[PDB]
Amino acid sequence: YLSDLCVSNHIAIPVTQELICKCVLDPKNSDILIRTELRPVEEEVWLTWTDKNNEHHEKSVRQLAQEARAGNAHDENVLSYYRYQLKLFARMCLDRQYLAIDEISQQLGVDLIFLCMADEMLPFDLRASFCHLMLHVHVDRDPQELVTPVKFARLWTEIPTAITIKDYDSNLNASRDDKKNKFANTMEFVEDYLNNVVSEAVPFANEEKNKLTFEVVSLAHNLIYFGFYSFSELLRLTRTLLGIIDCVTMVLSRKQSVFSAPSLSAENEDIVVMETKLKILEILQFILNVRLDYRISYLLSVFKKEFVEVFPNMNLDRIGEQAEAMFGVGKTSSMLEVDDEGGRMFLRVLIHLTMHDYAPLVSGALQLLFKHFSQRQEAMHTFKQVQLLISAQDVENYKVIKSELDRL
Amino acid sequence: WDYKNIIEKLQDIITALEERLKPLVQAELSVLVDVLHWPELLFLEGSEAYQRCESGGFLSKLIQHTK
């Protein structure tokens, strides 16, 4: 009831959220709240709770899970209470509620939640609860910020004569590596879980596993959108993502339409499976946007090389041939392609997703299907939108003008 | 380097590329139309999705969702 109270219409309400955070986290009413700690016992997670009779009890999380599996009522009830507590905590931290986020981060660290997530002996739903808590408390915070897959502002001298996928990654690899150190273990766990899910047939067969994979896919989508995945890792992950959707505590908060082309100037019964498929589709759309960015960079590099060579007459035919090479006719761009079958797997997945009952999933599938065959037109339009600046001061002027115009 | 010359060359290359790739875009759209014509061919014959596509499930769903 409290968890539903904090959030209304899937959007966090600041006032009631603040009141609930103050009341639950107040020094009083600590008996109701379960306490989680780490003990050397390497380290293990232990839960200590104060019973309504004022008799304190302590037990390891693994012991509680084993007892619940054996069918003991007390441990199962304690675990369910802990899950509802975790859901309430996650609702408290929704929409970057710093007041409660700070205290909850002090109470629960990244390592503890990662250990709980990676402890498969614990129940699947409990692991999903820790996945949700990790996504909201830690991954979504002040240091993390959204990224733009396509940048229409380029600097003439910074543009390399030749660009490669390795160079494209290395462009931002320093920042990505320095920011990914905290969540590197989480990324590895997510990748391992996705590989395990895709390896098994009929991945969406167990409801608890369905919830866990939905949480994992949400975490992966968040991390990708904050820019914590390199381009190469994204191309490696897209194959697995297509494999999962290969033909054989839920909040539906929607951000800016994922299925939107870059621009220079700006309740189903099985709804869990449909939502994870939709998240996978959003990830695939983001990957396609990064591919478009790489193609634009390649075109810009070719143009700059030709201009510098000609002007220390331009061979437009060679430029046209090079720009045609990327579109997938040749094997040079086979790396860019997100499918190993030449797009047959992607097209089949889109067709199998287009007739699903869920409406947002069908809309996304149709938009992706239409975007698939417009690679050339989209690339040309994106290149036309691109602007080149030879001075860094010009870049700063463009940035300030863009900010002012967007705000106005 | 000259900014005006760079801009002029950028416009020239953009125009040349735009003129060059129109028939390829038209061919891609035609291939999309052809694929939409026979959606089942992509799927395996024994698959139920193939049967639905052959009977018009895909196109019927598209028509229903368009409105």
The torsion angles phi and psi of B9, rounded to 5 degrees, stand at -65, -35
B42 shares contact with chain A (CB less than 8 Å): yes
Question: In chain A, positions 273-312, which contact chain B (CB-CB < 8 Å)?
Answer: 299, 303, 306-308, 311
Distances (CA, A) of A93 to A7, A12, A390: 10, 9, 44
Residue that has been written with the tokens 């915070």 in this structure? A141
- Residue B21 DSSP label: T
Element (H, E) at B22: helix B22-37
Give the Cα-Cα-Cα angle A306, A312, A313 (nearest 5 degrees): 50
Whether A96 has a binding-site annotation, put simply, is: yes
Chain A residues with CB inside 8 Å of B42's CB?
344, 347-348, 351
Contact flag A388-B42 (C-beta cutoff 8 Å): no
Resolution of the PDB structure in angstroms: 3.5
The 3-class secondary structure across chain A, one letter per residue, is CHHHHHEECCEECHHHHHHHHHHHCCCCCCCCCCEEEEECCCCEEEEEEECCCCCEEEEEHHHHHHHHHHCCHHHHHHHHHHHHHHHHHHHHCCCCCHHHHHHHHHHCCHHHHHHHHHCCCCCHHHHHHHHHHHHHHHHCCCCCCCCCCCCCEEECCCCCCCCCHHHHHHHHHHHHHHHHCCCHHHHHHHHHHHHHHHHCCCCCCCHHHHHHHHHHHHHHHHHHHCCCCCHHHHHHHHHHHHHHCCCCCCCCCCCCCCCCCCCCCCCCCCHHHHHHHHHHHHHHHHHHHHHHHHHHHHHHHHHHHHHHHHCCCCCHHHHHHHHHHHHHHCCHHHHCCCCCCCCHHHHHHHHHHHCCCCHHHHHHHHHHHHHHCCHHHHHHHHHHHCEEECCHHHHHHHHHHHHHHHHC
A325 shares contact with chain B (CB less than 8 Å): no
**Chain B CA closest to residue A329:** B24
A348 shares contact with chain B (CB less than 8 Å): yes
**Max intra-chain CA distance, chain A:** 90
Integer Cα distance of A241 and A368 in angstroms: 15
Strand partners of residue A35: A48
Comparing CA positions, the residue from A146, A147, A148, A151 lying closest to residue A297 is: A151
In Å, how far from its chain's centre is CA A356?
23
Tokens representing A31 are: 């008996």
Comparing CA positions, the residue from A215, A207, A214, A191 lying closest to residue A135 is: A215
Give SS3 for B28. helix
Q: Say how many residues make up chain B.
A: 67
Chain A residues with CB inside 8 Å of B21's CB?
323-324, 376, 380
- Residue B56 DSSP label: T
B10 shares contact with chain A (CB less than 8 Å): yes
The torsion angles phi and psi of A46, rounded to 5 degrees, stand at -125, 135
Burial class for A182, CB neighbours closer than 10 Å (0-12, 13-18, 19+): middle
Q: Provide the experimental method for this PDB entry.
A: cryo-EM
